[PDB]
Write a protein that binds this ligand. Structure first.
Ligand SMILES: [K+]
Ligand SMILES: [K+]
Ligand SMILES: [K+]
Ligand SMILES: [K+]
Ligand SMILES: [K+]
Ligand SMILES: [Mg+2]
Ligand SMILES: [Mg+2]
Ligand SMILES: [Mg+2]
Ligand SMILES: [Mg+2]
Ligand SMILES: [Mg+2]
Ligand SMILES: [Mg+2]
Ligand SMILES: [Mg+2]
Ligand SMILES: [Mg+2]
Ligand SMILES: [Mg+2]
Ligand SMILES: [Mg+2]
Ligand SMILES: [Mg+2]
Ligand SMILES: [Mg+2]
Ligand SMILES: [Mg+2]
Ligand SMILES: [Mg+2]
Ligand SMILES: [Mg+2]
Ligand SMILES: [Mg+2]
Ligand SMILES: [Mg+2]
Ligand SMILES: [Mg+2]
Ligand SMILES: [Mg+2]
Ligand SMILES: [Mg+2]
Ligand SMILES: [Mg+2]
Ligand SMILES: [Mg+2]
Ligand SMILES: [Mg+2]
Ligand SMILES: [Mg+2]
Ligand SMILES: [Mg+2]
Ligand SMILES: [Mg+2]
Ligand SMILES: [Mg+2]
Ligand SMILES: [Mg+2]
Ligand SMILES: [Mg+2]
Ligand SMILES: [Mg+2]
Ligand SMILES: [Mg+2]
Ligand SMILES: [Mg+2]
Ligand SMILES: [Mg+2]
Ligand SMILES: [Mg+2]
Ligand SMILES: [Mg+2]
Ligand SMILES: [Mg+2]
Ligand SMILES: [Mg+2]
Ligand SMILES: [Mg+2]
Ligand SMILES: [Mg+2]
Ligand SMILES: [Mg+2]
Lengths: 33, 66, 104, 137, 236
RNA sequence: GCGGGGUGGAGCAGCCUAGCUCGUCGGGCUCAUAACCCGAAGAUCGUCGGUUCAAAUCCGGCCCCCGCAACCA
RNA sequence: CACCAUGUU
RNA sequence: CAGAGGUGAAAUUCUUAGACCGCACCAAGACGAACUACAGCGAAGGCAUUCUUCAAGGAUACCUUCCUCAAUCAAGAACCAAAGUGUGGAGAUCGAAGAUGAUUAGAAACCAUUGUAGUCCACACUGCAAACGAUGACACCCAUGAAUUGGGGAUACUUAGUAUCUUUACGGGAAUAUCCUCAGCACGCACGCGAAAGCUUUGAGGUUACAGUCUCAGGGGGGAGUACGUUCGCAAGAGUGAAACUUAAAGAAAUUGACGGAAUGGCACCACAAGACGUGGAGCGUGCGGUUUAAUUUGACCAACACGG
């Protein structure tokens, strides 16, 4: 342990989830415009 | 086939559970022999004491200090 | 959290340098900055006292006058490796600032 | 058996013993002073049956005693010592059998000459095995 | 381990061997050092063909019986140039300080200065020399370190390069070997370099021959003087 | 129309005279559950017949399921 | 430096 | 000549078609050990073999020059570890992905053997890092002791010391000793400050006794650095950046306990070791639970169960 309580998953892996989600939404709007 | 050695110093109880005693044993050999007054460190199982005697069989392996 | 060491556990003051190239740990090979790694220079005898006296008897070169060669090697450890091998141990908060400048 | 150099009885005929003691095995290799010709090579794994014990001091002592037997048939009665660890980018600490093998050669009756440490020491190196986080055991 | 091999084929050695004597050049006290075994000539494989070019390593203290305590930390290598009966006539190959002595000269608050000099001898030998020097504190010095200025380090390196090049380029390989074995070159180097920088120790760590001239039988003979006889071929 | 398969509670061997694994049960280990340790039980061989001294096995018929065919106009 | 998962509000 | 490798132990793997090991070599690509330091240089990122070279940069020295030319900043511009992208090279080592072997209840994780992209170079992109001193820049004041790097100087008082070593050519030299000085990275440590941890001429001091100058950012926790729009980018992404809604705390530093497959020192046959005699298997007595019964009265689950005498 080196950081304080996160209250959630590891923030780096939370960032990866958001990045993956942002990519998926970006492609979905590509096939509708 | 078995060389007799004499315990001259008790070093302590070694290993877990303290069932093994490490001692320094002087090999009792006749004068002029290569093993005369040769002291080696061995591990002993059972109640032992200074001035006790051991039948060493082989006398080449030396126990690791602890 | 709270700052444990003014040193931050290395020897890199705030305005001395930016990057110190890492080294591989002696035991596990973890990459750690050279100023941060625990460094010990050890001089080791090739054989113990019992073994040295046996080899000296059969050696026409080695004896009471000619010493037998030693092992010279600088060992740098990762922090975890240095704690596990007991070359370094956790200390009370007061004693943490004690520094040694020579082998003792 | 003879098979030895034409020298006076008791004269010292020198070989070179290369003792490679890693943490998995011990090598007791006897060559000449050029290293090109090998009189005998016995390893600890040649003396035990369990993989975990090929580096043990007792296996190294047993292998060293086998070497002295063959050396006597060659005519070699004295040995220069060249001991090494793994070296390179790996560990430079000698293995457990390094001390046992040398002591066994001395007790077996072979004269010991010069002793040197010849582990490969790089003046700079390629990347060591493992990640930047090291071996996580 | 014993009895563990599964795939073996994937599908008296001494009897053949004959003993030989290794002979160092005449500038060494113990000429007939070492003793080796080679396969007896059989078929088209002549023994002298594979014997030429072998490099033998010996301690300097064993070659020269001079108990100066410095020769015991030097190894000398020789290359077999010609096979003459049962004698291996050698030529100097390299000289190197032992690993234990070299590693013991390092200190943690001084400058380690290294110099590489390549020199061509008079008889067409190219030698690469490696010189290591260490700074020392003065007698009354109280400073925590004796690190040297880079200007003086480069000056020391240049003076070492000039002295070694000037001294060794006008001599033969036999004389150059003597200059290196008896530490005459090292004594003059540390004498002329100490005024530049106070030196704890100046030592020629390694000497290696990198280029040899074409073989000359008469040159090899003149470097060996009176070759001692070998009794290996003689009946026991 | 041709070929092939049904076997303990489940999934599959043996198919040329009963097995494994998972599951279940009892006891241990643990504060307790799991994992682990020691034992035990559970099998009309899909039904109807036949051959044979003896048929899960060999020869027919029957019920499900499974595939491959079902073309030229 | 074998293997040690979990505990209703 | 019969194994080698590898691990906690193994196996995948290599090996009489000669592995491993031994000696001297050859090729290729990386890297520059020890010396290496609370050391130096750089705006930061970063920078460690030698020699030859090309432009710079800082400090110091000066009774040289000059004469407010400065400080800090939207916009704008350049640089920027690693990973990643494009095109050529290179491809030893290590090694995302993948493969195989283990371990496991499972393990496509940690461990083992490998291996692609990468890792290296040139050119062109990308502009993100715990890019950290988690501490913006310039300036002023500020107590003490021991050091260190570079350059110089000396050998309520009218002036207050001193050496050592080497020394035929980068040499009227070099390094040292004492004292002083300017600049730089810092250490142990006086005011004062702070929620505290701590900071302290290196401020986080000189602030409710609140004003030297400029600039950037923040306003409970989430939603969210998300959505939308827009600019930039080959892409990966980057910059800018909400709301609906949700929630009483989130958070900071310390204190005392408790706990740790953290460490130190001790201790115990309700622990082990060395052992003994059993218990667990059989019959039976008894207690407890189930089942049964009109009811089988009930408490108790190491510290309940020949216990409530
Ligand atoms: K092994
Ligand atoms: K838990
Ligand atoms: K071979
Ligand atoms: K980025
Ligand atoms: K009790
Ligand atoms: Mg912690
Ligand atoms: Mg903490
Ligand atoms: Mg925080
Ligand atoms: Mg989360
Ligand atoms: Mg700086
Ligand atoms: Mg950084
Ligand atoms: Mg540290
Ligand atoms: Mg093995
Ligand atoms: Mg660990
Ligand atoms: Mg200095
Ligand atoms: Mg669960
Ligand atoms: Mg170097
Ligand atoms: Mg890169
Ligand atoms: Mg490419
Ligand atoms: Mg598990
Ligand atoms: Mg799964
Ligand atoms: Mg697996
Ligand atoms: Mg598995
Ligand atoms: Mg795998
Ligand atoms: Mg697969
Ligand atoms: Mg950022
Ligand atoms: Mg930081
Ligand atoms: Mg700063
Ligand atoms: Mg920030
Ligand atoms: Mg900043
Ligand atoms: Mg400086
Ligand atoms: Mg100064
Ligand atoms: Mg104010
Ligand atoms: Mg807010
Ligand atoms: Mg862009
Ligand atoms: Mg665009
Ligand atoms: Mg692309
Ligand atoms: Mg592309
Ligand atoms: Mg007490
Ligand atoms: Mg017992
Ligand atoms: Mg019983
Ligand atoms: Mg029972
Ligand atoms: Mg009962
Ligand atoms: Mg109790
Ligand atoms: Mg009771």
């Amino acid at each position: 342990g080196t950081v304080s309580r996160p209250r959630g998953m590891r923030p780096k892996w939370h960032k990866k989830r958001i990045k993956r989600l942002k990519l998926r939404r970006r492609r979905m709007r590509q096939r509708s415009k | 086939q078995a060389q007799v050695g004499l315990i001259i110093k008790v070093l302590g109880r070694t290993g877990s559970r303290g069932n093994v005693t490490q001692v320094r044993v002087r090999l009792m050999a006749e004068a002029g022999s290569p093993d005369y007054n040769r002291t080696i460190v061995r591990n002993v199982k059972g109640p032992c004491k200074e001035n006790d005697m051991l039948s060493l069989m082989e006398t080449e392996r030396e126990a690791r200090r602890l | 959290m709270t700052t444990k060491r003014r040193n931050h556990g290395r020897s890199k003051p705030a305005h001395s340098r930016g990057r110190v190239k890492p080294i591989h740990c002696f035991n596990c090979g973890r990459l750690t900055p050279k100023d941060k790694a625990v460094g010990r220079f050890v001089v080791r005898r090739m054989l113990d006292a019992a073994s040295a006296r046996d080899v000296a008897e059969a050696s026409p070169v080695y004896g009471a006058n000619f010493p037998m060669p030693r092992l010279y090697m600088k060992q740098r450890f990762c922090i975890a490796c240095a704690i596990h091998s007991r070359t370094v141990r956790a200390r009370p908060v007061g004693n943490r600032k004690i520094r040694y400048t020579k082998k003792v | 058996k003879a098979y030895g150099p034409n020298v006076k009885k008791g004269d010292l005929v020198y070989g070179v013993v290369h003792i490679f003691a890693s943490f998995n095995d011990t090598f007791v290799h006897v060559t000449d002073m050029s290293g090109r010709e090998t009189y005998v090579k016995v390893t600890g794994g040649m003396k035990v049956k369990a993989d975990r014990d090929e580096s043990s001091p007792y296996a190294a002592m047993m292998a060293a005693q086998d070497v002295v037997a063959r050396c006597k048939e060659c005519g070699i009665n004295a040995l220069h010592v060249k001991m090494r660890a793994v070296g390179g980018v790996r560990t430079k600490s000698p293995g457990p059998g390094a001390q046992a093998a040398l002591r066994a050669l001395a007790r077996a009756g072979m004269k010991i000459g010069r002793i040197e440490d010849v582990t490969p020491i790089p003046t700079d190196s390629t990347r060591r095995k493992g990640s930047r986080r090291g071996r996580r055991l | 381990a014993l009895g563990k091999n599964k795939r073996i084929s994937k599908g008296e050695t001494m009897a053949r061997k004959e003993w030989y004597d290794v002979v160092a050049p005449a500038n060494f006290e113990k000429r007939q050092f070492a003793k080796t075994i080679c396969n007896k000539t059989q078929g088209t494989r002549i023994a002298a063909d594979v014997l030429r070019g072998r490099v033998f390593e010996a301690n300097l203290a064993d070659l020269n019986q001079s108990a100066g305590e410095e020769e015991a930390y030097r190894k000398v290598r020789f290359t077999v140039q010609e096979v003459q009966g049962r004698n291996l006539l050698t030529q100097f190959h390299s000289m190197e300080v032992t690993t234990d002595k070299m590693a013991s000269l390092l200190r943690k608050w001084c400058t380690t200065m290294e110099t590489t000099v390549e020199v061509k001898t008079a008889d067409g030998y190219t030698m690469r020399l490696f010189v290591v020097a260490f700074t020392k504190p003065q007698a009354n010095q109280q400073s925590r370190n004796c690190y040297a200025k880079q200007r003086l380090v480069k000056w020391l390196r240049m003076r070492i390069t000039k002295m070694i090049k000037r001294r060794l380029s006008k001599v033969q390989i036999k004389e150059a070997v003597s200059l290196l074995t008896r530490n005459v070159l090292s004594d003059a180097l540390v004498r002329r370099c100490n005024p530049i920088l106070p030196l704890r120790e100046l030592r020629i760590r390694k000497v290696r021959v990198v280029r040899t001239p074409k073989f000359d039988a008469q040159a090899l003979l003149s470097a060996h003087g009176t070759i001692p006889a070998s009794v290996e071929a003689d009946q026991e």
